[PDB]
Design an enzyme around this catalytic site. Sequence first.
Site, PDB file in Angstrom:
ATOM      1  N   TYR A   1       0.803  -1.220   0.000  1.00 39.03           N
ATOM      2  CA  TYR A   1       0.000   0.000   0.000  1.00 39.03           C
ATOM      3  C   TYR A   1       0.838   1.273   0.000  1.00 39.03           C
ATOM      4  O   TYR A   1       1.688   1.472   0.870  1.00 39.03           O
ATOM      5  CB  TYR A   1      -0.987   0.080   1.175  1.00 39.03           C
ATOM      6  CG  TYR A   1      -2.385  -0.274   0.760  1.00 39.03           C
ATOM      7  CD1 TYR A   1      -3.202   0.737   0.259  1.00 39.03           C
ATOM      8  CD2 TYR A   1      -2.928  -1.538   0.926  1.00 39.03           C
ATOM      9  CE1 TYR A   1      -4.481   0.487  -0.154  1.00 39.03           C
ATOM     10  CE2 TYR A   1      -4.242  -1.794   0.537  1.00 39.03           C
ATOM     11  CZ  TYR A   1      -5.006  -0.769  -0.018  1.00 39.03           C
ATOM     12  OH  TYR A   1      -6.295  -0.981  -0.451  1.00 39.03           O
TER      13      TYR A   1
ATOM     14  N   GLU B   1      -0.775   4.683  -0.706  1.00 37.40           N
ATOM     15  CA  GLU B   1      -1.648   5.833  -0.907  1.00 37.40           C
ATOM     16  C   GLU B   1      -0.854   7.123  -0.730  1.00 37.40           C
ATOM     17  O   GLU B   1      -0.007   7.246   0.159  1.00 37.40           O
ATOM     18  CB  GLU B   1      -2.828   5.801   0.054  1.00 37.40           C
ATOM     19  CG  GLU B   1      -3.761   4.637  -0.197  1.00 37.40           C
ATOM     20  CD  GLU B   1      -4.740   4.429   0.942  1.00 37.40           C
ATOM     21  OE1 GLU B   1      -4.275   4.192   2.067  1.00 37.40           O
ATOM     22  OE2 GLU B   1      -5.969   4.485   0.690  1.00 37.40           O
TER      23      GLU B   1
ATOM     24  N   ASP C   1      -7.616  12.737 -25.422  1.00 39.96           N
ATOM     25  CA  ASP C   1      -7.566  11.333 -24.998  1.00 39.96           C
ATOM     26  C   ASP C   1      -6.894  10.538 -26.123  1.00 39.96           C
ATOM     27  O   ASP C   1      -7.556  10.124 -27.075  1.00 39.96           O
ATOM     28  CB  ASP C   1      -8.981  10.839 -24.696  1.00 39.96           C
ATOM     29  CG  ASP C   1      -9.038   9.392 -24.172  1.00 39.96           C
ATOM     30  OD1 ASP C   1      -8.015   8.653 -24.197  1.00 39.96           O
ATOM     31  OD2 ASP C   1     -10.158   8.986 -23.770  1.00 39.96           O
TER      32      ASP C   1
ATOM     33  N   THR D   1      -4.567   5.481 -22.054  1.00 35.35           N
ATOM     34  CA  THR D   1      -4.236   4.153 -21.573  1.00 35.35           C
ATOM     35  C   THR D   1      -2.746   3.891 -21.747  1.00 35.35           C
ATOM     36  O   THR D   1      -2.017   4.645 -22.395  1.00 35.35           O
ATOM     37  CB  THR D   1      -4.982   3.093 -22.361  1.00 35.35           C
ATOM     38  OG1 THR D   1      -4.827   3.375 -23.765  1.00 35.35           O
ATOM     39  CG2 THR D   1      -6.422   3.113 -22.009  1.00 35.35           C
TER      40      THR D   1
ATOM     41  N   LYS E   1      -2.965  -0.889 -25.535  1.00 28.98           N
ATOM     42  CA  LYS E   1      -3.213  -0.500 -26.960  1.00 28.98           C
ATOM     43  C   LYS E   1      -1.895  -0.266 -27.663  1.00 28.98           C
ATOM     44  O   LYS E   1      -1.008  -1.098 -27.509  1.00 28.98           O
ATOM     45  CB  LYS E   1      -4.138   0.706 -27.041  1.00 28.98           C
ATOM     46  CG  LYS E   1      -5.352   0.437 -26.130  1.00 28.98           C
ATOM     47  CD  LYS E   1      -6.479   1.464 -26.353  1.00 28.98           C
ATOM     48  CE  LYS E   1      -7.768   0.984 -25.632  1.00 28.98           C
ATOM     49  NZ  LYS E   1      -8.853   1.954 -25.876  1.00 28.98           N
TER      50      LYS E   1
ATOM     51  N   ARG F   1      -2.123  -2.772 -18.741  1.00 33.59           N
ATOM     52  CA  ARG F   1      -3.387  -2.054 -18.638  1.00 33.59           C
ATOM     53  C   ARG F   1      -3.313  -1.095 -17.462  1.00 33.59           C
ATOM     54  O   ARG F   1      -3.299  -1.522 -16.298  1.00 33.59           O
ATOM     55  CB  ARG F   1      -4.538  -3.036 -18.480  1.00 33.59           C
ATOM     56  CG  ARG F   1      -4.910  -3.666 -19.783  1.00 33.59           C
ATOM     57  CD  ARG F   1      -6.068  -4.632 -19.649  1.00 33.59           C
ATOM     58  NE  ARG F   1      -6.114  -5.395 -20.886  1.00 33.59           N
ATOM     59  CZ  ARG F   1      -6.850  -5.069 -21.933  1.00 33.59           C
ATOM     60  NH1 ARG F   1      -7.729  -4.075 -21.879  1.00 33.59           N
ATOM     61  NH2 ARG F   1      -6.701  -5.754 -23.065  1.00 33.59           N
TER      62      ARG F   1
END
Lengths: 467, 467
Positions: A60, A62, A216, A242, A245, A251
């Site tokens: 973790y 954050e 985008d 992304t 692609k 991803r």
Amino acid sequence: HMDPVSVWGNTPLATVDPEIHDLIEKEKRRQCRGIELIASENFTSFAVIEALGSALTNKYSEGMPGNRYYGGNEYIDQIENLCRSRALQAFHLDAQSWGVNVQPYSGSPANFAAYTAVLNPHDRIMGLDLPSGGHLTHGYYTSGGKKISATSIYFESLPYKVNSTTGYIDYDRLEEKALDFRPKLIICGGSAYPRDWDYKRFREVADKCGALLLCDMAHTSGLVAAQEVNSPFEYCDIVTTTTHKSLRGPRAGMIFYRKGPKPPKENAVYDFEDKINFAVFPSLQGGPHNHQIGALAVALKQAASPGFKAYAKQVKANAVALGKYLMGKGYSLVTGGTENHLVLWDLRPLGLTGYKVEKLCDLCNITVNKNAVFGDSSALAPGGVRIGAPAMTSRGLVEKDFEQIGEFLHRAVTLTLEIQKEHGKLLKDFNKGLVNNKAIEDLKADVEKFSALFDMPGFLVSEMKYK
Amino acid sequence: HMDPVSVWGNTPLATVDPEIHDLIEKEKRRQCRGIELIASENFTSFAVIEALGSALTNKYSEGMPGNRYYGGNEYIDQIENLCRSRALQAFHLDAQSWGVNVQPYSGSPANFAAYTAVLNPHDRIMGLDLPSGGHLTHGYYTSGGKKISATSIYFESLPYKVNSTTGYIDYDRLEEKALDFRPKLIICGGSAYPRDWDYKRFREVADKCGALLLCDMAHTSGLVAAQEVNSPFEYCDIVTTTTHKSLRGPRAGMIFYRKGPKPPKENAVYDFEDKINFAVFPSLQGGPHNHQIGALAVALKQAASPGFKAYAKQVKANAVALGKYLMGKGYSLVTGGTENHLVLWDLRPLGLTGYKVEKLCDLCNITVNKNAVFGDSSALAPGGVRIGAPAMTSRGLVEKDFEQIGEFLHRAVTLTLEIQKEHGKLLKDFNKGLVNNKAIEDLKADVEKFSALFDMPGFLVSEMKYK
């Protein structure tokens, strides 16, 4: 009695879960025994996969590097910092003019976080209409007023369209809509548009109406990195993408944003960095997925290599040579060609729907997808198919190979027409001709043998389970 | 010339990206050379990691099994279907009464999708106050009215609190607030609450005010699966969760929802399934992360094993034995003990802040985190630390080992006090005592050697780079 750590925790997948292992092996075969033409698909590298499946998922973190909730982040910090600096380098961005956040879980989380950062709820957005090649996350509501995209639920969207005769973006109607509607944000970039974008003109429209301008670039980010298409960075305030692609990474998602002095017309600076980071965390996400960030960092070093520039060049040349092959057969492409990684094939002149061709291709393990053409929003089933080059190009196919792919698609459309002619136009009739169709079985056999002639990144075909 | 597939696509991470490889190896050492007490942290299995880093990342599968946008999903469909049925089995749910969606990218995406499914923008929500142990995604705004959580940006939240003297949820004040405010949704479950939840009482309150009731079981889902705490499923309409933390899976999220006929309260049925699925996709997410879904399916089979039930039992026993050890030293825990995987240690009676203890522990590679106590929303630095048992329990530690952990914590607080006594109460003074503190170096050495005595899931300590 608990299981020993070695039993539950160190034992390989093939022993722990033979069902899941087996299914992954079957999917690995499927990936290299057909022809993958989905324009948003790629095959990523083993290096990326090794980072993705790693102990990085156990941490973790954050917060932001050097400003985390929890301690013990000394090495997570270094990975994310290196991921971020590699992100700027990959897209040739000055660190004093551009920043990036690399924690978005995927493309759509990256867009919604960007919107949350710069807009209030119900602020107005425009984006490319879905039947014109736009993406769900740019806004989508139905003719009955039903809000489908979260972008249209929590904000107020209005789409702009391609010209219905040329297939190019209608920049004049875009400007008129922006001046009527007055969006706070204009989105450019899309999912099924076969040409480059005139970002300079979008900047003029955004300036004229007072809008923020976001690109985008999910579909073409690999081409952008290789400077093979127009750079949205020259004209846009924010660039989302992304990382899979055409970038060929894991991803994930990324949000680029301008920094430093605002360009001449007082002495004010850009204000995006803090808002963007804060939208991602704490507003929207929890702990970042550090295995994705590590894997992303790997992909971004690979995207900066001379080999990747040659790949993006080849992607573009393969899409061109495929399109020219199809047109040589008398087929129609929207706009009559491509400037990027995909073509959009108009099937209405043949009296076919995209679905029929997609279905028959799919029965032969050729994966394309049906797509609306010329922005037609009619209830009429979509009139085309979308075909991309990134995935097969990653397996090493060049122009001659994509000319052969065009041959297989030619045969696919021919068989689709023979079936329609024998059984009938209505969908119920068409399906009757798919039952035990020999000729479909020969094309399926033909494409498998062709498919098996090429290499595969990400895993070794030589140690597969299913050959 | 493009790189051969073997060069860019099949070469291992260690060769492709030595920097990133090296950082992952250092993080691997860090993970087994200290004491991990972050209550939301765990160490997952190699089998999960092998599915996570796999060719499943190469497939787009927008939609639901059997209803996908794209073809070629025959094996992705089987993996997701098996993941869903395993999710139901793991939590002892009848498939006619409960459904699940396994596409959320993480815990926070799962909550926001659930809200989007059942609420309109600006609908009212209540959730456990952050300084009372709630989570950000349940609603959070500051004293100045600043909306921090997306949940408070797009919805109207109001928190409920623990009793400031007992540390237990104030069920009376909860009911009174819910009757005044009239939330459309009440959230239960939390991040730093050391007791079980009375879902039966939350159901009574929700029925009295006409609210939906959702449990967010992220922190305790592993204990729920093993039936070691109260099941939220007996009383809640919707149950969300992460799949890491005490469930010991990959980082992902899940949304459980009731199906079938409603209890008498007309022959009506529940109406959540389609709305939930639709909120996840197409409204909010793009392509699911199939490698996460595969890894999740692995984790869920593992969570149904007798060994995992014994793990959850041991997690609870270790947290108990750790707390009893601390109280045996005169330390105070909020509520005087625990019923789950964590304790909450009130440091204010020692004249200390959570930060000081967290920082000194962090310098000894003991990872805890500071936490408000008794729901104190005061601007005073939080007066406690949160300590969890899942991660060390997954390395095989039992009660005797967690009693030794309490010894290290005892020594840590003892040095924090010596430093404060010598240098002073203000933060600036405290830090002066951390500069080249020999006694801290000894505890750090003691912690590393203790840490080294235990096994590690997920990778083989034998073939580590750094030993």
